[PDB]
Coordinates of C-alpha atoms in Angstrom, one line a residue:
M1 CA -63.9 -90.2 5.3
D2 CA -65.4 -90.2 8.9
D3 CA -67.6 -87.3 8.9
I4 CA -70.7 -87.7 10.9
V5 CA -68.2 -89.5 13.8
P6 CA -68.7 -90.4 16.5
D7 CA -72.4 -89.0 17.2
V8 CA -73.7 -91.3 14.5
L9 CA -71.5 -92.7 12.0
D10 CA -68.2 -92.3 10.2
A11 CA -70.3 -91.7 6.7
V12 CA -73.6 -89.9 5.5
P13 CA -75.4 -93.4 4.2
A14 CA -77.8 -92.5 1.2
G15 CA -80.2 -94.9 2.8
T16 CA -80.2 -97.3 5.8
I17 CA -80.2 -101.0 7.3
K18 CA -83.3 -102.7 9.1
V19 CA -82.1 -104.6 12.1
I20 CA -84.5 -106.1 13.7
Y21 CA -83.8 -107.4 17.4
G22 CA -86.7 -109.0 19.3
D23 CA -88.3 -109.2 15.8
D24 CA -91.0 -107.0 17.9
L25 CA -88.7 -104.3 17.2
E26 CA -85.4 -103.2 15.6
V27 CA -82.5 -100.6 16.0
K28 CA -82.2 -97.2 14.4
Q29 CA -79.4 -94.6 14.3
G30 CA -77.8 -96.1 17.1
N31 CA -80.5 -95.8 19.4
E32 CA -80.9 -97.8 22.5
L33 CA -82.7 -101.1 23.3
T34 CA -83.9 -101.7 26.7
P35 CA -84.9 -103.3 29.1
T36 CA -81.6 -105.4 28.5
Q37 CA -83.3 -106.9 25.5
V38 CA -80.3 -106.4 23.4
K39 CA -79.9 -110.4 24.3
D40 CA -81.8 -110.7 21.2
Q41 CA -80.7 -112.1 17.9
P42 CA -80.5 -108.8 15.1
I43 CA -82.2 -109.1 11.8
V44 CA -80.9 -107.4 9.0
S45 CA -82.5 -106.6 6.0
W46 CA -82.4 -103.5 3.3
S47 CA -86.1 -105.1 2.0
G48 CA -86.9 -101.9 -0.1
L49 CA -84.1 -100.3 -0.9
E50 CA -82.3 -103.6 -3.1
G51 CA -83.1 -103.1 -6.9
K52 CA -80.7 -104.0 -9.4
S53 CA -77.0 -104.7 -8.4
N54 CA -73.8 -107.6 -9.6
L55 CA -73.2 -107.8 -5.6
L56 CA -73.3 -105.9 -2.2
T57 CA -71.3 -105.7 0.7
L58 CA -72.3 -105.4 4.2
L59 CA -69.4 -104.2 6.7
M60 CA -69.9 -103.8 10.5
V61 CA -68.2 -101.1 12.3
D62 CA -67.6 -100.8 16.3
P63 CA -63.8 -101.3 16.5
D64 CA -63.4 -101.0 20.4
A65 CA -62.5 -104.5 22.4
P66 CA -61.8 -105.2 24.8
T67 CA -62.8 -101.3 25.4
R68 CA -62.4 -98.3 23.2
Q69 CA -60.1 -96.8 26.1
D70 CA -57.8 -100.1 25.9
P71 CA -57.9 -101.5 22.5
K72 CA -55.5 -104.8 24.0
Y73 CA -56.7 -106.5 20.9
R74 CA -59.6 -105.0 19.0
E75 CA -61.4 -105.7 16.9
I76 CA -62.8 -109.3 18.3
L77 CA -65.0 -111.3 16.2
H78 CA -67.1 -109.7 14.1
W79 CA -69.8 -110.1 11.0
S80 CA -68.1 -109.2 7.8
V81 CA -70.3 -109.9 4.7
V82 CA -69.5 -109.3 0.9
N83 CA -70.4 -110.2 -2.5
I84 CA -74.2 -110.5 -1.3
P85 CA -76.4 -110.8 -4.7
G86 CA -77.9 -107.0 -4.9
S87 CA -81.4 -108.7 -4.3
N88 CA -81.6 -111.0 -1.5
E89 CA -83.1 -108.4 0.9
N90 CA -80.1 -109.3 3.4
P91 CA -76.4 -110.4 3.6
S92 CA -76.9 -114.1 3.1
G93 CA -76.2 -115.2 -0.4
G94 CA -72.7 -113.7 -0.1
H95 CA -69.2 -114.5 1.0
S96 CA -69.2 -114.1 4.8
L97 CA -65.6 -112.4 5.5
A98 CA -66.1 -113.3 8.9
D99 CA -68.8 -115.7 10.0
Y100 CA -71.5 -114.3 12.3
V101 CA -71.1 -114.6 16.1
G102 CA -73.4 -113.5 18.7
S103 CA -70.3 -113.5 21.2
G104 CA -69.5 -109.9 20.9
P105 CA -66.5 -108.1 22.7
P106 CA -65.9 -109.0 27.1
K107 CA -67.8 -107.2 29.3
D108 CA -65.1 -104.8 30.0
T109 CA -66.2 -103.2 26.4
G110 CA -69.5 -102.1 27.9
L111 CA -72.3 -100.2 25.9
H112 CA -70.8 -100.9 22.3
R113 CA -72.0 -99.6 19.1
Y114 CA -72.4 -101.9 16.8
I115 CA -73.1 -100.4 12.9
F116 CA -73.9 -102.0 9.9
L117 CA -73.0 -100.3 6.7
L118 CA -73.9 -101.4 2.9
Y119 CA -72.6 -100.7 0.0
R120 CA -73.5 -102.0 -3.6
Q121 CA -70.7 -104.5 -4.8
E122 CA -70.0 -104.2 -8.5
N123 CA -66.9 -106.6 -8.9
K124 CA -66.5 -110.3 -7.3
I125 CA -63.7 -110.5 -5.0
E126 CA -63.0 -113.6 -3.6
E127 CA -62.2 -112.1 -0.2
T128 CA -60.0 -114.8 1.2
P129 CA -61.8 -118.1 2.3
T130 CA -64.9 -118.1 4.3
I131 CA -63.8 -117.7 8.0
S132 CA -65.7 -119.6 10.7
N133 CA -67.1 -117.7 13.6
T134 CA -65.4 -120.1 16.0
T135 CA -62.1 -118.6 14.5
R136 CA -59.4 -118.8 17.2
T137 CA -56.7 -116.7 17.8
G138 CA -55.3 -115.2 14.9
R139 CA -57.9 -113.3 12.8
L140 CA -59.5 -110.8 15.4
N141 CA -57.3 -107.8 15.3
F142 CA -58.4 -105.9 11.8
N143 CA -59.9 -102.6 10.9
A144 CA -63.3 -103.2 9.1
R145 CA -63.1 -99.7 7.1
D146 CA -60.3 -101.1 5.3
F147 CA -62.7 -103.3 3.0
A148 CA -64.2 -99.9 2.3
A149 CA -60.8 -98.4 1.7
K150 CA -59.6 -101.0 -0.4
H151 CA -62.7 -101.3 -3.0
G152 CA -63.6 -97.9 -2.4
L153 CA -66.8 -98.8 -0.5
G154 CA -66.0 -95.2 0.9
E155 CA -69.8 -93.7 0.4
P156 CA -72.4 -96.6 1.7
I157 CA -75.3 -96.7 0.1
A158 CA -77.4 -98.2 3.4
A159 CA -76.6 -97.8 7.0
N160 CA -78.1 -98.8 10.4
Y161 CA -76.6 -98.8 14.0
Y162 CA -77.2 -99.7 17.7
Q163 CA -75.5 -99.4 20.8
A164 CA -76.1 -102.3 23.6
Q165 CA -74.0 -103.9 26.7
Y166 CA -74.8 -107.4 28.5
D167 CA -73.8 -109.6 31.0
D168 CA -70.3 -111.5 30.3
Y169 CA -72.5 -114.1 29.8
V170 CA -72.5 -113.3 26.4
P171 CA -68.9 -112.8 25.6
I172 CA -68.5 -116.3 27.2
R173 CA -69.7 -117.4 23.6
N174 CA -66.1 -116.5 22.7
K175 CA -64.6 -119.0 25.0
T176 CA -66.4 -121.6 23.1
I177 CA -64.1 -120.7 19.6
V178 CA -61.5 -123.4 19.2
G179 CA -61.2 -122.2 15.3

């Protein structure tokens, strides 16, 4: 049930996620990062919120590609993760639905709001073999919210988001994709 959208998030998180970009800073409630520092790798962590859970679910939200105005083939590549052990602080030890890729959508998308959603996972789910980041065409277009709908991850335990745009140079990373 999309509630606080598109003001901040299509769901009211009980907590949040801590994504550290430049290491010196971090993203908060769709805040904007400047100047053009949105080129540094984001470090996701819920350190302190975790505790005791069979598993966890990290879902990404920002379906706009190549642009929210012309979804020629949205979504592109995304950092989807599930089955994360409820005590790793970050979505590492779990199944990477779709391996992380700092490529991101093409310049045509402009400032895009990458949103990180965290949800406690109780049941061990295969969720199909781990998809590689360099995954060639044929497995890009797909709504993230679906993962939430299928296992009922509706209500998010912790969420964090940020808005960023960059030179077509970043999207170029996608070109290296060969499956």
